[PDB]
Protein backbone atom coordinates (compact mmCIF):
# COMPACT_ATOMS: atom_id res chain seq x y z
CA UNK A 1 0.00 0.00 0.00
CA UNK A 2 0.74 3.76 0.02
CA UNK A 3 -0.41 6.38 -2.59
CA UNK A 4 2.29 8.90 -3.54
CA UNK A 5 2.72 11.70 -1.02
CA UNK A 6 2.99 15.32 -2.02
CA UNK A 7 5.81 17.40 -0.59
CA UNK A 8 5.07 21.15 -0.78
CA UNK A 9 6.80 24.29 0.49
CA UNK A 10 6.76 27.97 1.22
CA UNK A 11 9.79 30.21 0.83
CA UNK A 12 11.19 31.41 4.17
CA UNK A 13 14.14 33.74 3.67
CA UNK A 14 16.93 31.80 1.91
CA UNK A 15 15.44 28.33 2.46
CA UNK A 16 12.16 26.45 1.99
CA UNK A 17 9.73 25.40 4.70
CA UNK A 18 8.10 22.10 3.75
CA UNK A 19 4.79 20.40 4.33
CA UNK A 20 2.96 17.23 3.29
CA UNK A 21 -0.29 17.98 1.50
CA UNK A 22 -3.14 15.48 1.96
CA UNK A 23 -6.32 16.74 0.27
CA UNK A 24 -6.91 20.29 1.51
CA UNK A 25 -4.71 19.86 4.63
CA UNK A 26 -1.00 20.59 5.05
CA UNK A 27 1.01 18.91 7.80
CA UNK A 28 4.07 20.94 8.69
CA UNK A 29 6.17 22.03 11.64
CA UNK A 30 5.48 25.13 13.73
CA UNK A 31 9.05 26.31 13.08
CA UNK A 32 9.92 29.98 12.49
CA UNK A 33 13.55 29.25 11.62
CA UNK A 34 15.28 26.06 10.47
CA UNK A 35 18.67 26.65 12.15
CA UNK A 36 17.02 27.66 15.44
CA UNK A 37 14.70 24.65 15.23
CA UNK A 38 17.64 22.31 14.51
CA UNK A 39 19.70 23.51 17.46
CA UNK A 40 16.66 23.65 19.78
CA UNK A 41 16.02 19.98 18.94
CA UNK A 42 12.23 19.92 19.17
CA UNK A 43 9.24 20.85 17.03
CA UNK A 44 5.48 20.75 17.10
CA UNK A 45 3.42 19.57 14.16
CA UNK A 46 0.47 21.54 12.90
CA UNK A 47 -2.18 20.56 10.39
CA UNK A 48 -3.55 23.56 8.51
CA UNK A 49 -6.17 24.17 5.90
CA UNK A 50 -4.41 24.77 2.56
CA UNK A 51 -4.46 28.56 2.00
CA UNK A 52 -3.57 28.17 -1.70
CA UNK A 53 -0.08 29.67 -1.11
CA UNK A 54 2.00 26.44 -1.12
CA UNK A 55 4.28 25.40 -4.00
CA UNK A 56 4.56 21.76 -5.17
CA UNK A 57 8.01 20.26 -4.58
CA UNK A 58 7.88 16.51 -5.26
CA UNK A 59 5.34 13.73 -5.57
CA UNK A 60 6.65 10.28 -4.73
CA UNK A 61 5.91 7.30 -2.41
CA UNK A 62 6.78 7.78 1.27
CA UNK A 63 9.66 5.28 0.89
CA UNK A 64 11.41 7.63 -1.56
CA UNK A 65 11.69 10.15 1.28
CA UNK A 66 12.17 7.81 4.26
CA UNK A 67 15.01 5.99 2.55
CA UNK A 68 17.01 9.27 2.40
CA UNK A 69 16.06 10.88 5.71
CA UNK A 70 15.14 8.06 8.13
CA UNK A 71 18.27 5.96 8.03
CA UNK A 72 21.51 5.02 9.75
CA UNK A 73 23.56 7.92 8.37
CA UNK A 74 21.10 10.68 9.34
CA UNK A 75 21.57 11.13 13.08
CA UNK A 76 19.01 13.27 14.93
CA UNK A 77 18.44 14.45 18.50
CA UNK A 78 15.10 15.89 17.40
CA UNK A 79 11.86 15.28 19.31
CA UNK A 80 8.48 15.84 17.68
CA UNK A 81 5.09 16.56 19.25
CA UNK A 82 1.73 17.60 17.75
CA UNK A 83 -1.68 19.19 18.46
CA UNK A 84 -4.99 17.31 18.82
CA UNK A 85 -5.76 18.49 15.26
CA UNK A 86 -2.79 16.39 14.05
CA UNK A 87 -3.87 12.95 15.31
CA UNK A 88 -5.14 12.28 11.77
CA UNK A 89 -1.50 12.16 10.55
CA UNK A 90 -1.07 8.37 10.85
CA UNK A 91 -4.20 7.60 8.85
CA UNK A 92 -3.47 10.37 6.32
CA UNK A 93 0.22 9.71 5.60
CA UNK A 94 0.48 5.99 6.41
CA UNK A 95 -2.96 4.69 5.20
CA UNK A 96 -1.48 1.28 4.35
CA UNK A 97 0.04 0.68 7.80
CA UNK A 98 -2.78 0.44 10.29
CA UNK A 99 -0.27 -0.34 13.09
CA UNK A 100 1.79 2.87 13.05
CA UNK A 101 1.98 4.73 16.40
CA UNK A 102 1.56 8.49 16.50
CA UNK A 103 5.13 9.11 17.72
CA UNK A 104 6.51 7.04 14.82
CA UNK A 105 4.40 8.91 12.30
CA UNK A 106 5.57 12.28 13.73
CA UNK A 107 9.18 11.11 13.94
CA UNK A 108 9.26 9.90 10.33
CA UNK A 109 7.44 12.82 8.72
CA UNK A 110 9.28 15.30 10.96
CA UNK A 111 12.69 14.01 9.84
CA UNK A 112 11.54 14.28 6.24
CA UNK A 113 10.34 17.87 6.64
CA UNK A 114 13.41 19.13 8.53
CA UNK A 115 15.80 17.28 6.21
CA UNK A 116 14.12 18.77 3.12
CA UNK A 117 14.29 22.28 4.64
CA UNK A 118 17.96 21.84 5.46
CA UNK A 119 18.81 20.51 1.98
CA UNK A 120 16.84 23.45 0.39
CA UNK A 121 19.98 25.44 1.29
CA UNK A 122 21.54 23.72 -1.78
CA UNK A 123 18.74 24.83 -4.10
CA UNK A 124 18.60 27.71 -6.58
CA UNK B 1 28.81 -3.30 -5.10
CA UNK B 2 32.26 -1.76 -4.61
CA UNK B 3 34.37 -2.06 -1.40
CA UNK B 4 32.99 -0.21 1.63
CA UNK B 5 33.96 3.44 2.05
CA UNK B 6 34.38 5.15 5.42
CA UNK B 7 32.39 8.29 6.12
CA UNK B 8 34.11 10.40 8.80
CA UNK B 9 33.60 13.86 10.32
CA UNK B 10 35.06 16.63 12.45
CA UNK B 11 32.69 18.27 14.94
CA UNK B 12 32.76 22.01 14.20
CA UNK B 13 30.06 22.85 16.77
CA UNK B 14 27.49 24.39 14.41
CA UNK B 15 27.75 21.25 12.29
CA UNK B 16 29.64 18.02 11.57
CA UNK B 17 32.07 18.34 8.69
CA UNK B 18 32.06 15.11 6.71
CA UNK B 19 34.80 13.49 4.67
CA UNK B 20 35.61 10.15 3.02
CA UNK B 21 38.59 8.37 4.53
CA UNK B 22 40.60 6.18 2.13
CA UNK B 23 43.69 4.77 3.86
CA UNK B 24 45.46 7.63 5.60
CA UNK B 25 43.84 10.30 3.37
CA UNK B 26 40.54 12.17 3.89
CA UNK B 27 38.67 13.72 0.98
CA UNK B 28 36.53 16.68 2.06
CA UNK B 29 35.43 20.21 1.17
CA UNK B 30 37.71 23.14 1.87
CA UNK B 31 34.96 24.99 3.75
CA UNK B 32 34.70 26.07 7.40
CA UNK B 33 30.93 26.80 7.48
CA UNK B 34 28.37 24.53 5.77
CA UNK B 35 25.86 27.42 5.61
CA UNK B 36 28.37 29.58 3.72
CA UNK B 37 29.23 26.71 1.37
CA UNK B 38 25.59 25.85 0.65
CA UNK B 39 24.59 29.47 -0.09
CA UNK B 40 27.77 30.39 -2.00
CA UNK B 41 27.17 27.35 -4.22
CA UNK B 42 30.76 26.34 -4.97
CA UNK B 43 33.47 24.39 -3.13
CA UNK B 44 36.97 23.14 -3.53
CA UNK B 45 37.84 19.53 -2.71
CA UNK B 46 40.97 18.74 -0.77
CA UNK B 47 42.71 15.56 0.22
CA UNK B 48 44.56 15.67 3.54
CA UNK B 49 46.78 13.36 5.54
CA UNK B 50 44.82 11.90 8.46
CA UNK B 51 45.70 14.19 11.41
CA UNK B 52 44.08 11.73 13.87
CA UNK B 53 41.25 14.19 14.65
CA UNK B 54 38.50 12.52 12.53
CA UNK B 55 35.55 10.63 14.00
CA UNK B 56 34.26 7.44 12.40
CA UNK B 57 30.68 8.00 11.17
CA UNK B 58 29.72 5.03 9.06
CA UNK B 59 31.04 2.27 6.83
CA UNK B 60 29.01 1.38 3.75
CA UNK B 61 29.45 0.95 -0.02
CA UNK B 62 29.55 4.20 -2.00
CA UNK B 63 26.22 3.21 -3.61
CA UNK B 64 24.48 3.37 -0.22
CA UNK B 65 25.15 7.11 -0.31
CA UNK B 66 24.98 7.97 -4.05
CA UNK B 67 21.54 6.36 -4.42
CA UNK B 68 20.18 8.60 -1.61
CA UNK B 69 21.91 11.98 -1.95
CA UNK B 70 22.22 12.32 -5.75
CA UNK B 71 18.52 12.71 -6.61
CA UNK B 72 15.77 14.64 -8.48
CA UNK B 73 14.66 16.56 -5.36
CA UNK B 74 17.91 18.26 -4.36
CA UNK B 75 19.58 18.54 -7.76
CA UNK B 76 23.11 19.66 -8.54
CA UNK B 77 23.45 23.47 -8.76
CA UNK B 78 26.65 23.29 -6.67
CA UNK B 79 29.98 23.72 -8.55
CA UNK B 80 33.04 21.72 -7.43
CA UNK B 81 36.73 22.01 -8.18
CA UNK B 82 39.69 20.24 -6.65
CA UNK B 83 43.40 20.59 -6.00
CA UNK B 84 45.93 18.63 -8.05
CA UNK B 85 46.54 16.57 -4.88
CA UNK B 86 42.86 15.55 -5.03
CA UNK B 87 42.91 14.10 -8.57
CA UNK B 88 43.33 10.62 -7.06
CA UNK B 89 39.64 10.82 -6.01
CA UNK B 90 38.24 8.84 -8.97
CA UNK B 91 40.65 5.93 -8.48
CA UNK B 92 40.25 5.88 -4.68
CA UNK B 93 36.45 6.23 -4.38
CA UNK B 94 35.29 4.79 -7.74
CA UNK B 95 37.78 1.87 -8.46
CA UNK B 96 34.90 -0.05 -10.09
CA UNK B 97 34.14 2.75 -12.61
CA UNK B 98 37.50 3.41 -14.27
CA UNK B 99 36.02 5.66 -17.02
CA UNK B 100 34.29 8.03 -14.54
CA UNK B 101 35.22 11.65 -15.17
CA UNK B 102 36.76 13.75 -12.42
CA UNK B 103 33.89 16.27 -12.43
CA UNK B 104 31.32 13.47 -12.08
CA UNK B 105 33.35 12.02 -9.20
CA UNK B 106 33.58 15.42 -7.49
CA UNK B 107 29.85 16.07 -8.13
CA UNK B 108 28.76 12.79 -6.59
CA UNK B 109 31.02 12.77 -3.54
CA UNK B 110 30.39 16.53 -3.12
CA UNK B 111 26.61 16.04 -2.93
CA UNK B 112 27.14 13.26 -0.37
CA UNK B 113 29.40 15.45 1.83
CA UNK B 114 27.23 18.56 1.51
CA UNK B 115 24.13 16.51 2.33
CA UNK B 116 25.64 14.79 5.36
CA UNK B 117 27.15 18.06 6.61
CA UNK B 118 23.78 19.89 6.32
CA UNK B 119 21.81 17.02 7.85
CA UNK B 120 24.24 16.95 10.79
CA UNK B 121 22.31 19.98 12.11
CA UNK B 122 19.60 17.48 13.24
CA UNK B 123 22.21 15.81 15.40
CA UNK B 124 24.41 18.54 16.94
Contact check, Cβ <8 Å, A122/B114: yes
Contact check, Cβ <8 Å, B68/A72: no
> Who's near B53: CB < 8 A, 6+ residues apart?
B10
Of A77, A118, A124, the CB nearest to B119: A118
Rounded (10°) angle between helices B62-69 and B102-119 = 80
Q: A interface mutation test: which of B119, B120, B124 has the most A CBs within 10 A?
A: B119
- Provide the edge-to-edge strand list for the sheet that holds A42-49: A55-60, A5-12, A15-22, A25-29, A42-49, A79-82
Pair B45, B110: CB distance under 8 Å = yes
DSSP B12: -
Q: What is the 3-state secondary structure (H, E, C) of chain A?
A: CCCCEEEEEEEECCEEEEEEEECCEEEEECCCCHHHHHHHCEEEEEEEECCCCCEEEEEECHHHHHHHHCCCCCCCCCEEEECHHHCCHHHHHCCCCCCCCHHHHHHHHHHHHHHHHHHHHHCC
Domain span including residue A100: 5-122
Rounded Cα distance, B124 and B119, in Å: 10
> Who's near A112: CB < 8 A, 6+ residues apart?
A7, A18, A20, A65, A66, A69, A70
Q: Which of A53, A83, A69, A72 is nearest to A5 (CA)?
A: A69
> Who's near B123: CB < 8 A, 6+ residues apart?
A75, A76, A77, B16
Q: Total domain count for chain A?
A: 1
Q: B interface mutation test: which of A43, A59, A108, A121 has the most B CBs within 10 A?
A: A121
| Burial degree of B53 (CB within 10 A; 0-12, 13-18, 19+) | exposed
At B117 the three-state DSSP class reads helix
Question: What is the CB-side half-sphere exposure of residue A124 using CA atoms within 13 A?
Answer: 2
Amino acid sequence: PGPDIELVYKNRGFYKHYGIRIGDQIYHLNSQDILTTAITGKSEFIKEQDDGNWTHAMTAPLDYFTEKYVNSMVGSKHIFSCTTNCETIARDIFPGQSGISQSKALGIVGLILLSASLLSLLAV
